[PDB]
Every structure is written in C-alpha cells, then in structure tokens.
C-alpha cells in the first residue's frame, strides 16, 4: 500500500539473499512489524527469519487486532449500507480494502476493489482505485495485473493530465519500464521531474533520482544528455545532494576512466540489493561498458596499446579478449588490426551501410511477400 | 522483451562459472597489472 | 461423334488461340489511345484563364 | 489409417530402446502419410522418429520439425512431457555451436531437469578440454548414465569442432602463441590446415606468413564497401528483381483469376 | 480389343488436359476482355468527355 | 547382407568386409557416401573391438586433420592384417594431405616441410618438381601466380547489365 509497509516489507530481498545486510532489515521489520498490520507478509516470509520462540508472542495479539478491525469495518460497512449515498459506501469498502492491502491479502481486497471498481462514479475515482491496485502490484511484481487496469484504464480520460495523477501515473511508467529493458522509450518518461515532489507511497524524490540516473546516464548518448539534462537545471540542483552522482556523470561526460574504473565499484555494489533494480544489472554493466568503448572507439580510429592501457588504467591481457568477445558477440565496429600491436579499425559503415540498412527489411520483407505468394490460391 | 534475453543470458550466463562481477577485482588489479 | 469431338474440337482450339496475339493488340493499342486522347483533353487546361467565385 | 498409426507408435516405442536395424524401418516404414493428426501424435511421433533420427546428428531437419513439434500439443500439458524432448533438443543444439538455452518458458520442472546438463551445456561454448573433461566426469551421473554414452563420448571429441567453428565467426586469422595457446592447441600444423580447409570453404579468405617463426596476417577482411562494388552485389540486384518480378507476376495473375469470372 | 476403353481413355483424358489448357486460354480471354472493357469504357468516357 | 528377411545369421567377417568397403569409399574419396552412410552401421554388435571404432576415429582424425596421431598411432593397430591396407590408404591421402599442406598461397619455409612432409628420400621433390611444375629457389619454395588477376574492364558486366535491362523491359513490360 501507500503506507511505509511497502518499503520495509520491499526491504526483504535484500533480507533474504545476503547474510551481511539481514540485521537492520530484521531490525526495522522486526520493530516495524507491529505497524500497518504486518502480521502475515512476515509470516508468509518467517523461512526467512528467526525462530519461533518470539514469533508466537505477538501472534495472539495480531490475530484478534485483526478480527477486531475487521469487524468494526464490517459493522461501518453495514451501516453504511441500504442508505442513500455513493462516497459513504465506497469509502467504506474503499477504505475496508485498504486494510485488506494492510494486511496484504488480495483476495479479499481483489473483490473489494472489484466490488468498489464497479462502483466508481467517474473515471478519476476509477484511476485512483487502479492506482491502488499497483501500490500493491509493486510489491507483488506482478506482469499482466499491472498493465490490464492501465491498459483499460489509460484511454478516456478527457479530464487532462493532473499535476501529480498524470504524472504519478508517469512515475509507474518508470517502474515497470526499469523493470522492464526498454529504454528507448523510457528515456522521454523522467522530462516531467520538475512537477514531481516527495512522495513516500511508492519512491521517495532522492531514490526517484537515484533510480532514473542509471537508466538516463547509460540509455541516454552524450548529445541526449547535453540537451535534456545537462541544459536543464534538475541535476544542476539534485547534484549537491550526493557528490558521487556528480563524479560518475563529470567522468563519463569527461572520459575519465582513470576514476571511473576505481570508483565503478560503488556502482556495482550499490546496482545489486535492490528490490527491481537487481536483477537487471548485469545489462547496465555490458551495455556502459561498451557505450564507453563505442564513445571512445568512435571519435578515435586507430589506438595503441599504451594510450589505451594508460587511459583505462588495466593490463592488456584483459581488454584483449574484451574487444575478441565484443567485436564478434558485441558486434560495435569492424576487423581489428593486430600487426604492430595497435588497436587499428575502419568502420566503413557510413558510405554502403548507411545504404546497406535497408537490405533486412528489404530481405525479411521478401520472406514477407513469399508468405503472400502462400497466400494465393490456399 | 526475450529477444535481449539472448545476449544477456549469452555473457550472464557465460560468466557464471568464473569471473562473474570481475569489477570489484580491477581495484587489485591495477596495481598487481 | 465420340471420335470426332478431338478433331471438330481443334477448330475451337485455332479459334480460341488465335484471340491471345489479337487481345494483345487491343491491350497494348487502346492503351496508347487512351494516353492520346488524355493528352488531348489534358492540354485543353491552358495558363491563360480568368478566376470566378 | 489411424488405428493402424496408432499400433505403428506402439511397435516404433518397442523399437526405441534397442534395435539399432535401419534396413526396414528406414526407407520402408515411410508410407504415403495421410491425415494423422491427432492434435498430438505430431508432437509424440515426431518426437519417436527424431529420436530414431537422432543418431545421424541431424542439423537441419529435426531442429525446426523437432522445435515445432516441441511448440505442438498445448491442449494437456506442455510441461511434464516436454521436458524430455526438451532435454535432447538442446542436446542436439549445442552441437551446432550456438545453444540456445531457457528464454520464454518459466515453470518449475524443466529448471531441476537441467540443472545438472546447466553447467555443460554453457561449458560447450568456451570449449575448455582440460578442466571440463574432469568436470563431466566428475559429478556426472545421469547425462552420462543415460547409456552407452554415445552423443556425449561423441561430445567430448566435438568440443574441438565447436570450438573451431567458434572461430570462424570469430576472426579469422589465427595466431601462433595468442590464440593458439588461448585454444590449448600449440601446433602450426593441423591450426594452418584447418584454417586452409576454411579458406577453401568460400566464405572467408585469409593468408599464411613466415618471416622469423612466427605466422604473420594482413587480417584485412574489409567488406565489399568500395572493393568492386559492381561484381559484389549484381547478382544480388538480378536475384532480387528476379524474386521481385516474379512476384510482381504474382500480384498480376491473381487479379486475372479475379475478373475470370466476371 | 481393350484401346477405346484404354487407348483412346488415356487419349480422351489428354484431350480434357487439353480442354484445361482451352481453359485457362478461354478465362484469359474473359477476364483479358472484361478488363479491355474496362480500358474501352474509361477511353470511352473521356471520349464522351 | 541388405536383404528383408532377418534369419541370416551375422557373420564375423561382415564387419571386416564393411570395413573394407568403408576404406574403399574413404580411399576413392567418396566421403560423402561415408556421412551419409553412418546412419545405418550404428547396430552396436561388438562395440568393444578396435577395429569397429577405428574407421570413425581414424576418419575424425581425418576431418580433424591432425596426422601426427595416425603415425604415432601406427603401432597402436593389432596383428590384424589390414596394416599394409592401411598403409595403402596413406599412399592414396598422401596426395590430398601433402597437396592441401602445399598449397603455397604466400610464402613456405623448407623448415617446416621438413616436419609435415615425410622422411629425407627425395620422392616427393622429384614427384611434385614434375607434377606441380613450380620454381626452385634458394632451399625455399616460392608461390607465384597468388591473387595477380586482373580485375575487369568493366565493359563486359556493362553489355550483360545491358542485356539484363533488355530482360527487365521484356518480363516487366510483355503483356502491357
């Protein structure tokens, strides 16, 4: 839900798979579990957790808070009810369903938002229970739940996009396209940062920056970046919040590997232990690295083996089968030269490639129109 | 999208036995090579 | 009758084949014609016009 | 003949195990195949008689007939039986080179099924003798307990082809202590021959040289861009006008079986 | 005997291959002057223009 | 031996003379015959014998192209009598192993044909003096006539682009 349970129970990833880290998750969660209900997301998750000594304690007591809870919504619902309103009732079960997302039941919840989705009076109150629906699909990382309500839910809106609804609705569309390895439509969802504010439901502004500055700094090209975040003044303000991010974005803009190398572990420890920005980072690490040899490889034609083992500061024997596993899997420019032991390409793919593009779709297309010949007469 | 899903499990899936991360090592080996 | 069906046949076989070189010149002649009188009732529109409302 | 098929899959199962005889079967038991289809004897018959063609090596045929037929019979289960054709599918497929491994299935079975044959089937691509040769046998069990051990000894002497073939969409050119002590192959003998056996294959051209030991290369493997242009690709222009024209004949007749009638 | 029936069959089954080549001559020259018509009638109309 | 009924008895010498065949189908370079015949000996009859994996071995090694294996390997062969058969053999691959490692695109030193070519007796640079018909230098073997073609004039593919036009004007404009 909207409340801070989404954040300390979205912290069990990190409590579960590594060891070290699994003190202060089980410290705050432990503490914080007598909050927002927690009883059965830590009980679905005790494998995960310590023994049953201190489990059973509380147990009592959260099972009949529970009951009592949801009897006393009961009783509000039926009072609510055969009486001649719209928003009493929905708030009722509205608000019986956020106690349901309390407790982290979305069967209960599944047909109270039904029950309550099929009471909206307007599109926006519809929108706002498909929100509701996500704030809870985060945490589930469910697929298609996710995307069928905004699918649906997304055209016929003839209100116009709100400060914070749209562009909360543009703040999901960057959770699941970071989920997701679409970047190049991504790269145009994060321009309306400016009306954002702090919003503790689902990402605060600081890890809201913090998520979008791997997906802009590494989808995003040198003249991509020049235009819509170097000229704006967002990560000219956000930038004295930390001084890393400054480092890591003057290094790559400046190519500095010499820091970018000694520091890129930070990078790395910090990309894994994620909740939905872990296991994906093998694919930033890949896809930076050889943006960076395509940006240093592209203004540079020919490159020695010392300018280059003194630029990136590593030995040769490493960046060796770099570029032999990179130029046949990578596929980034042509043949190498290795007579002299200088890095010595060519890269005729301007005068005939740039030509030479068309001959996929010109041969896929002929796959295409065999297909209509198949057509014909069956 | 499962068509990236190739070379991500080409050079994932290729590092899995050894050198998987292979970043955290450059910091020893800067001096060592 | 049954016999003669093959050979009283053939003369609708040369009947019927001598059509393809004659449908080849009405397809390749009324074709020029017709671009000729489009040019004659398209050079019709001249430059020097007046304008109405 | 569908009852007669249906004993056929029976008396082809009982020649699964241990028959070995391709004097009958093969070239005798192919019939003029009516219709039978049975919405899964395509995926378990085809499955049978890939299996009996499975001893060949066949590339070409039972990877897109066997893959599709993997693709066939969703209605009951696609899981709990598939696993098997599964298995042998990508057993086959890593022979070739490039295996492609579990991208858009994901259920609980086929993951513990080829956990054992995970860190093989990724070992083929790099292609270490050494290592990997005690690392089959060391935990092997079940992959090579399947029996007789024929596809897998067979393997063993492939991971040189397959790495071999490796190269050869990797460059071309090859090297005398770099590359020929990266493939743990330090022989200018059979690394020339074979390199000479690609040369002559058409597909790529590269040279030998030999000034103080060492083989040198020129590695200009530089694409036909401004290296006559005109003999590069004019096939390619009078093919796919070809192609084209004759579809153009295939966009002009149908409208005259359009207006036939009318 | 055993040719009218054999002999002149398989020379009669030619002869209807022979009727399906007469065929496809014969819905050429359908369809070749149904669309000829086409052609007439559009030069006819501006013709008639 | 290809027959329908199946009550003949196997012979032991079935295999040897198989193998025979197989070596003159290996020897009369019909080894496509080989590939697409190995779908129907795979019957696992002994399977324990060396002379029932030695065709596959030997012509993998063969398509391998490592010969240093099959001389080092010479002495690994039983008292099966098929040795001098199998010497044979040699003498009729010596010409495709020896032409294919002579091929001289650039440039081969004598000193490595020292090691691939066979002993010191002066058969195969008499032989090869008269049957390849190349130039002697200084104990060096020298390759002429290696990518010195000419390229075209460019008027010939103009006259046969041309006659490709007249084609393109005949199919693209016959029935009009």
């Given at each position: 839900p909207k409340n801070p349970d989404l954040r300390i129970a979205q912290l069990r990833f990190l409590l579960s798979l590594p060891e070290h880290r699994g003190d202060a998750a089980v410290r705050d969660e432990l503490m914080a579990a007598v909050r927002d209900n927690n009883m059965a997301p830590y009980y679905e998750a005790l494998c995960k957790s310590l023994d049953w000594q201190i489990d059973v304690d509380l147990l009592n007591k959260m099972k009949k808070a529970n009951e009592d809870e949801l009897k006393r919504l009961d009783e509000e619902l039926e009072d609510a009810e055969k009486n001649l309103g719209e928003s009493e009732i929905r708030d009722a079960m509205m608000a019986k369903a956020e106690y349901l997302c309390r407790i982290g039941d979305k069967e209960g919840a599944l047909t109270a938002f039904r029950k309550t989705y099929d009471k909206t009076v307007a599109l926006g109150h519809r929108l706002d229970i498909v929100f509701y629906l996500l704030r809870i699909g985060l945490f589930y990382m469910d697929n298609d739940l996710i995307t069928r309500n905004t699918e649906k839910a997304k055209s016929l809106i003839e209100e116009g996009g709100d400060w914070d609804r749209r562009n909360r609705l543009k703040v999901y569309q960057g959770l699941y396209c970071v989920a997701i390895r679409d970047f190049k439509q991504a790269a145009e969802l994060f321009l309306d940062t400016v009306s954002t504010f702090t919003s503790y439901e689902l990402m605060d502004y600081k890890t809201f920056v913090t998520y979008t500055v791997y997906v802009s700094m590494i989808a995003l090209e040198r003249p991509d970046l020049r235009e819509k975040v170097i000229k704006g003044a967002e990560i000219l303000e956000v930038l004295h919040s930390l001084?890393?991010?400054?480092?890591?974005?003057?290094?790559?803009?400046?190519?500095?590997?010499?820091?970018?190398?000694?520091?890129?572990?930070?990078?790395?420890?910090?990309?894994?232990?994620?909740?939905?920005?872990?296991?994906?980072?093998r694919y930033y690490v890949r896809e930076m690295r050889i943006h960076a040899y395509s940006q240093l490889l592209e203004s540079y034609r020919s490159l020695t083996l010392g300018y280059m083992a003194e630029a990136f500061g590593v030995?040769?024997?490493?960046?060796?089968?770099?570029?032999?596993?990179?130029?046949?899997?990578?596929?980034?420019h042509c043949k190498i030269d290795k007579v002299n032991e200088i890095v010595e390409t060519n890269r005729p793919d301007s005068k005939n490639w740039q030509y030479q593009e068309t001959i996929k779709k010109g041969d896929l297309l002929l796959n295409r129109v065999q297909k209509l010949s198949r057509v014909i007469n069956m | 999208v499962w068509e990236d899903n190739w070379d991500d499990d080409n050079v994932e899936d290729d590092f899995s036995n050894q050198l998987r991360a292979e970043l955290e090592k450059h910091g020893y080996k800067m001096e060592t090579s | 009758d049954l016999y003669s069906r093959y050979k009283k046949l053939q003369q609708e076989l040369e009947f019927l084949e001598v059509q393809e070189e004659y449908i080849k010149d009405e397809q390749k002649n009324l074709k020029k014609e017709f671009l000729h009188a489009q040019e004659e009732v398209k050079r019709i529109q001249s430059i020097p016009l007046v304008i109405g409302q | 003949?569908?009852?007669?098929?249906?004993?056929?899959?029976?008396?082809?199962?009982?020649?699964?195990?241990?028959?070995?005889?391709?004097?009958?079967?093969?070239?005798?038991?192919?019939?003029?195949?009516?219709?039978?289809?049975?919405?899964?004897?395509?995926?378990?018959?085809?499955?049978?008689?890939?299996?009996?063609?499975?001893?060949?090596?066949?590339?070409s045929e039972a990877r897109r007939t066997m893959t599709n037929a993997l693709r066939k019979a969703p209605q009951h289960t696609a899981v709990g039986f598939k696993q098997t054709v599964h298995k042998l599918l990508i057993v086959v497929e890593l022979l070739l080179g490039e295996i492609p491994d579990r991208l858009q299935f994901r259920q609980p079975s086929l993951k513990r099924s080829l956990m054992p044959y995970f860190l093989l089937t990724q070992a083929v691509r790099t292609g270490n003798l050494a290592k990997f040769n005690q690392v089959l046998d060391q935990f092997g069990e079940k992959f090579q307990a399947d029996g007789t051990y024929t596809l897998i000894i067979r393997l063993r002497h492939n991971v040189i082809k397959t790495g071999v073939r490796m190269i050869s969409l990797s460059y071309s050119r090859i090297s005398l202590a770099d590359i020929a002590q990266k493939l743990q192959l330090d022989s200018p003998e059979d690394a020339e021959f074979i390199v000479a056996k690609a040369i002559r294959d058409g597909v790529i051209e590269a040279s030998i040289n030999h000034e103080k030991g060492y083989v040198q290369s020129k590695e200009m493997i530089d694409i036909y861009s401004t290296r006559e242009p005109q003999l590069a690709f004019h096939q390619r222009i009078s093919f796919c006008l070809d192609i084209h024209n004759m579809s153009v004949k295939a966009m002009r007749f149908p409208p005259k079986s359009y207006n036939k009638d009318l | 005997l055993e040719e009218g029936k054999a002999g002149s069959g398989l020379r009669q089954y030619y002869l209807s291959k022979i009727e399906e080549l007469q065929?496809?001559?014969?819905?050429?020259?359908?369809?070749?002057?149904?669309?000829?018509?086409?052609?007439?009638?559009?030069?006819?109309k501006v013709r008639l223009l | 031996y290809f027959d329908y009924k199946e009550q003949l008895p196997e012979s032991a010498y079935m295999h040897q003379l198989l193998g025979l065949n197989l070596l003159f189908l290996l020897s009369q370079n019909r080894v496509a015959e080989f590939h697409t015949e190995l779908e129907?000996?795979?019957?696992?009859?002994?399977?324990?014998?060396?002379?029932?994996?030695?065709?596959?071995?030997?012509?993998?090694?063969?398509?391998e192209g490592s010969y240093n294996k099959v001389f080092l390997a010479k002495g690994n062969i039983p008292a099966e009598s098929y040795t001098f058969f199998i010497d044979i053999l040699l003498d009729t691959i010596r010409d495709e192993i020896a032409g294919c490692i002579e091929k001289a695109y650039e440039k081969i030193l004598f000193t490595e044909a020292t090691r691939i070519l066979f002993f010191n007796t002066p058969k195969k640079m008499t032989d090869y003096a008269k049957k390849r018909g190349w130039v002697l230098g200084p104990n060096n073997y020298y390759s002429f006539a290696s990518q010195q073609q000419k390229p075209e004039d460019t008027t010939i593919p103009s006259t046969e682009l041309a006659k490709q036009v007249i084609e393109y004007a005949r199919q693209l404009e016959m029935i009009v």
């Open positions: 001084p890393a991010v400054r480092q890591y974005l003057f290094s790559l803009y400046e190519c500095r590997y010499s820091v970018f190398f000694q520091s890129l572990a930070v990078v790395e420890q910090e990309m894994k232990k994620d909740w939905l920005f872990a296991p994906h980072y030995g040769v024997e490493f960046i060796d089968q770099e570029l032999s596993r990179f130029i046949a899997a990578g596929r980034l | - | - | 003949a569908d009852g007669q098929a249906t004993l056929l899959n029976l008396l082809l199962r009982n020649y699964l195990h241990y028959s070995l005889y391709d004097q009958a079967e093969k070239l005798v038991s192919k019939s003029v195949f009516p219709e039978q289809a049975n919405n899964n004897e395509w995926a378990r018959y085809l499955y049978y008689t890939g299996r009996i063609k499975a001893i060949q090596l066949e590339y | 065929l496809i001559v014969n819905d050429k020259s359908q369809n070749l002057r149904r669309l000829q018509a086409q052609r007439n009638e559009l030069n006819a | 129907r000996l795979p019957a696992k009859d002994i399977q324990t014998n060396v002379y029932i994996k030695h065709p596959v071995s030997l012509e993998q090694y063969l398509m």
